[PDB]
Paper text:
The next unusual PTM reaction on TglA-Cys is performed by a complex formed by TglH and TglI, in which the cysteine β-methylene (β-CH2) of TglA-Cys is removed to generate TglA-CysΔCH2. Like MbnB and MbnC, TglH and TglI of the [name] holoenzyme likely function as a catalytic and recruitment subunit, respectively, to achieve TglA-Cys modification. Here, we report the structures of [name] in the absence of Fe ions, with two Fe ions, and with three Fe ions (apoTglHI, [name]-2Fe and [name]-3Fe, respectively). The interaction with TglI is required for TglH catalytic activity, indicating that the [name] complex acts as a holoenzyme for 3-thiaGlu generation, akin to MbnBC.
Therefore, E. coli BL21 containing a [name] plasmid were cultured in LB medium supplemented with 1 mM ammonium ferrous sulfate. This procedure resulted in [name] crystallizing with iron and structures of [name] with two or three Fe atoms were determined and named [name]-2Fe (3.25 Å) and [name]-3Fe (3.49 Å), respectively. Structural comparison between apoTglHI and [name]-2Fe revealed that loops L4 (residues 258–275) and L2 (residues 107–126) of TglH are in very different orientations. Loop L4 closes over the active site in the [name]-2Fe cap whereas loop L2 swings away from the active center. The conformational changes in the loops induced by binding of two Fe ions result in the overall transition of TglH from an open to a closed active site cavity. In addition, the changes upon iron binding enhance the hydrophobicity of the active center with an increase in buried surface area of about 309 Å2 (from ~493 Å2 to ~802 Å2). In the [name]-2Fe and [name]-3Fe structures, Fe1 and Fe2 are coordinated by His71, His107, Glu151, Asp184, His216, and Glu258, as well as water molecules. The structural models of [name]-2Fe and [name]-3Fe were supported by ICP‒OES, which illustrated that the number of Fe ions per heterodimer of [name]-2Fe and [name]-3Fe was 1.50 ± 0.09 and 2.48 ± 0.18, respectively. Structural superposition of [name]-2Fe and [name]-3Fe illustrated no significant conformational changes (RMSD: 0.63 Å), implying that the third iron plays a minor role in the [name]-3Fe structure. In this work, it appears that two Fe ions are sufficient for TglA-Cys modification.
Numbering used by the authors:
A (entry chain A): 1 to 269
B (entry chain B): 1 to 295
The structure:
């Protein structure tokens, strides 16, 4: 019995609720599924007695996994968690529903990928479909998760004498005026929000600091949307999406001066 | 650094697992060492950050006053995945260096890119696992740049395919890897009670007590409870007997007292926190016993 086979065996056991039920109900050798491989059943045969501990170990696994659903939310989407906790959604019922769809997967240190899959799963929850303001808040937090994940191994880009879009900032065009919740977090999920679009910029001051939300003008969002690929500083001022063919100067220079200050763009030099 | 040695004795402290429920109960200047669970200050590995930016503030606030020890749990140290890919070398190794920790301790469990599979899975006591785990322990200690201790594990089911006893496993592990031991006395007591043929006397004589750097004193569940190792109640008297006996045989570098976290550690426990001075009595008794066998 190699140690890796004993670990691989249990790793298969506590991810499939079907295999756990036949183990709990059957203590007899062949009454538990002999469909387990002979090498596997050999390791199951050691647990013939003290099968009570098996149900206790599996129950503690899913208990911690249900709690990790909340820890992943606190890490990635702390404001969405406070909004969901204020409207009283059974996050335990949503944890079990989410984890069973993933076959009780242990994300481990992959907390941002955990939270990203959680926010996507919660975006389709029927309980949350009646709360469009929170659904807008969670998509904002999902961009923050994608901001961190996009900075794990970012594609390096030199100066290249062109306006470049960095990897330390993202933009989110909201559906509701989420700034009312960001400026008054005690009202998260509790108050009502107008359905006006906002351009909130998720940016990191330093690489070892908490991401911050701030609003930018629609013209600054136009400059950020045109810098998806780095532009030649002259084509960018031309690329107002066929609306303007003239350089605005200080009208658009100060906007670019703020974006670089927010670690959102890279000026050409 | 070429050869890691046991540091000079630095004293007794508490584990600071309650990041909030301990600063106000913290008293006087008697305790100048506190343990730090590196998992709580850990940042996600699918992110670019090493430490939680909220945790960087207290490390600044606490590193100046108290020496802060490291504790690696859920780091997947003795797993089957590549050591370079584990959370130990990607997060726990830099965190201990950032904390300026004199040494670091792990756990004798199993983990492969997973956090909550590690408890209730002790390492298979076999010469095959002795060789594999010692090679990882020596390499991991080399990456830490500090002594690496292995905490004795409390478990209800011994891993199948066990060729030897737990004490011989740890003695063969630290002798082949050159690492050290982190003696959790309460884990020995709960293993002596809930396991057939666990010789408590042979356990202490087998272990290279000259390899113990740190000690853990803790309480447990009372008779009749669902399961044990709750780390909540008062430190049992048999655990106090092991603390006085260990200090009369070897010389550790520190001893820490641990308690439960915020949420219920197991399936069903409580949150109450009103017996704050019982901790002071448990610490003070350890302080007196420490000086009774002081260097
Ligand atoms: Fe521990
Ligand atoms: Fe411990």
């Amino acid at each position: 019995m190699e140690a890796e086979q004993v670990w691989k065996l249990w790793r298969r056991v506590l991810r499939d609720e079907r295999l756990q039920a036949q183990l709990f109900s059957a203590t007899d050798a062949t009454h538990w599924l002999s469909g387990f491989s002979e090498s596997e059943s050999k390791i199951l045969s050691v647990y013939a007695q003290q099968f009570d501990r098996v149900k206790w170990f599996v129950e503690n696994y899913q208990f911690r996994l249900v709690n990790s659903f909340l820890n992943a939310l606190e890490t990635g989407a702390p404001l969405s968690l406070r909004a969901l906790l204020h409207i009283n959604v059974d996050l335990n019922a949503q944890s079990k529903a989410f984890l069973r769809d993933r076959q009780w997967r242990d994300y481990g240190p992959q907390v941002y990928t955990y939270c990203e899959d959680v926010l996507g799963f919660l975006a389709e929850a029927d309980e949350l479909q009646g709360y469009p303001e929170i659904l807008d808040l969670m998509r904002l937090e999902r961009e923050s998760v994608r901001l961190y994940r996009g900075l794990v191994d970012p594609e390096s880009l030199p100066a290249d004498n062109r306006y470049q879009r960095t990897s330390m900032a993202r933009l989110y065009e909201t559906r509701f005026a989420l700034s009312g919740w960001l400026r008054q977090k005690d009202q998260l999920g509790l108050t009502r929000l107008p359905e006006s679009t906002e351009h909130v910029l998720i940016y990191l001051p330093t690489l070892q600091a908490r991401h911050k939300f701030t609003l930018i003008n629609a013209q600054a969002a136009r400059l950020y949307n045109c810098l998806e690929q780095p532009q030649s500083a002259a084509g960018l001022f031309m690329l107002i999406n066929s609306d303007s063919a003239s350089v605005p100067g200080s009208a658009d220079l100060a906007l670019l001066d703020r974006l670089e200050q927010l670690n959102a763009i890279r000026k050409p030099l | 650094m070429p050869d890691f040695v046991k540091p000079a004795p630095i004293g007794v402290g508490i584990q600071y697992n309650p990041e909030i429920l301990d600063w106000f109960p913290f008293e006087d200047i008697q305790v100048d060492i506190l343990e730090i669970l590196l998992d709580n200050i850990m940042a996600p590995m699918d992110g670019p950050q090493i430490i939680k930016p909220s945790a960087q503030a207290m490390i600044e606030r606490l590193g100046q006053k108290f020496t802060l020890l490291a504790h690696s749990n859920y780091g997947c140290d003795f797993g089957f995945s590549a050591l370079e890919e584990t959370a130990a070398v990607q997060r726990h190794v830099p965190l201990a260096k950032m904390l300026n920790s004199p040494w670091v301790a792990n756990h004798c469990f199993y983990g492969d890119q997973s956090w909550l599979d590690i408890w209730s899975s002790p390492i298979q006591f076999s010469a095959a696992e002795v060789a594999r785990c010692a090679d990882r322990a020596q390499s991991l200690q080399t990456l830490y740049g500090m002594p690496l201790a292995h905490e004795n594990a409390a478990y209800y089911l011994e891993c199948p395919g066990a060729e030897m006893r737990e004490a011989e496993f740890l003695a063969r592990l630290v002798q082949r890897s050159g690492t050290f031991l982190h003696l959790d006395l309460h884990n020995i007591y709960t293993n002596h009670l809930n396991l057939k043929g666990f010789d408590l006397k042979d356990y202490m004589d087998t272990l290279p007590l000259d390899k113990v750097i740190s000690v853990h004193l803790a309480g447990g569940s009372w008779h009749g409870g669902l399961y044990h190792d709750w780390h909540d109640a008062c430190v049992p008297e048999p655990v106090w007997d092991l603390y006085e006996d260990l200090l009369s045989r070897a010389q550790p570098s520190a001893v820490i007292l641990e308690y439960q976290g915020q949420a219920h550690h197991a399936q069903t426990r409580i949150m109450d926190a009103s017996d704050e001075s019982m901790i002071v009595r448990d610490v003070q008794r350890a302080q007196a016993i420490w000086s009774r066998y002081n260097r």
